[PDB]
Amino acid sequence: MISLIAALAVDRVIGPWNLPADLAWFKRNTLDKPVIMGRHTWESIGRPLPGRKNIILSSQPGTDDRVTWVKSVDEAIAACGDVPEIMVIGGGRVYEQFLPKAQKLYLTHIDAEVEGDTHFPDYEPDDWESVFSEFHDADAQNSHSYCFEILERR
């Protein structure tokens, strides 16, 4: 099953905030699963995320034997093997091209106004069912209130 995970400020902007809570949610959901990423998230991460196979969806070749470089969506998939779930962690372009094959979304809705270049693709309500939502306040550690939600494609 293909699943997307993303943190969204208002307007579903993905790109400011300091959310340790969002990061332990991200970790708990991708640990021990393949994670499909875009070349820029790669360069911004800079090294393999531990505990996951890293597969990079890029047009030019890789320069890193530590991960899997894939030229397309179907090769992404194929590179993953026989696992119950594949996590799409981002790009905007990546999320856009995987949406149509996704069955689950894991979103962090951060109450925060921002001016960014990228958006999460628009998913359609009559298409997903919200099976989970959990609301949190800003705190000693997390600068903004946030909510965790999971949607399954109905």
- Nearest approach, Cβ of residue 101 and Cl ion (Å): 21
CA distance 114 to 8: 10
Kindly report the backbone phi and psi dihedral angles of residue 86, in degrees, each rounded to the nearest multiple of 5, phi listed first: -115, 130
Mapping DSSP to helix (H, G, I), strand (E, B) and coil, where does residue 119 land?
A: strand
- Nearest approach, Cβ of residue 50 and Cl ion (Å): 7
Q: Given the complex with Cl ion, which of 21 and 76 has the nearer CB atom?
A: 21
Does 71 count as an annotated binding residue? Answer: yes
- Residue among 82, 23, 90 at smallest CA distance from 55: 90
CA distance 90 to 148: 17
Cβ(116)–Cβ(154) below 8 Å? no
Q: Given the complex with Cl ion, which of 3 and 69 has the nearer CB atom?
A: 3
Q: Given the complex with Cl ion, which of 44 and 133 has the nearer CB atom?
A: 133
- Nearest approach, Cβ of residue 44 and Cl ion (Å): 20
- Residue 123 amino acid letter: Y
Does 92 count as an annotated binding residue? Answer: yes
- Residue 44 amino acid letter: S
- Nearest approach, Cβ of residue 77 and Cl ion (Å): 26
**Residue, CB closest to Cl ion:** 109
CA distance 27 to 31: 6
Task: Enumerate the known binding-site residues for NADP(+).
Answer: 7, 13-15, 40-41, 58-59, 71, 90-97
Task: Enumerate the known binding-site residues for substrate.
Answer: 5, 22, 47, 52, 108
Task: Enumerate the known binding-site residues.
Answer: 5, 7, 13-15, 22, 40-41, 47, 52, 58-59, 71, 90-97, 108
